[PDB]
Design a binder for this molecule. Structure first.
Ligand code: LI
Ligand code: NA
Length: 35
């Protein structure tokens, strides 16, 4: 898979990566280090 975020960068916060599976696995795969 390509490793990008699919929402605007400034939405991909440390807090959302910690507390939302949606952010980790769908919206912010790059910023949350899912890839
Ligand atoms: Li996850
Ligand atoms: Na992107």
């Amino acid at each position: 898979r390509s490793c990008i975020d699919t929402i605007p960068k400034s939405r991909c916060t440390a807090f959302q990566c910690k507390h939302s599976m949606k952010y980790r696995l769908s919206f912010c795969r790059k910023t949350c280090g899912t890839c």
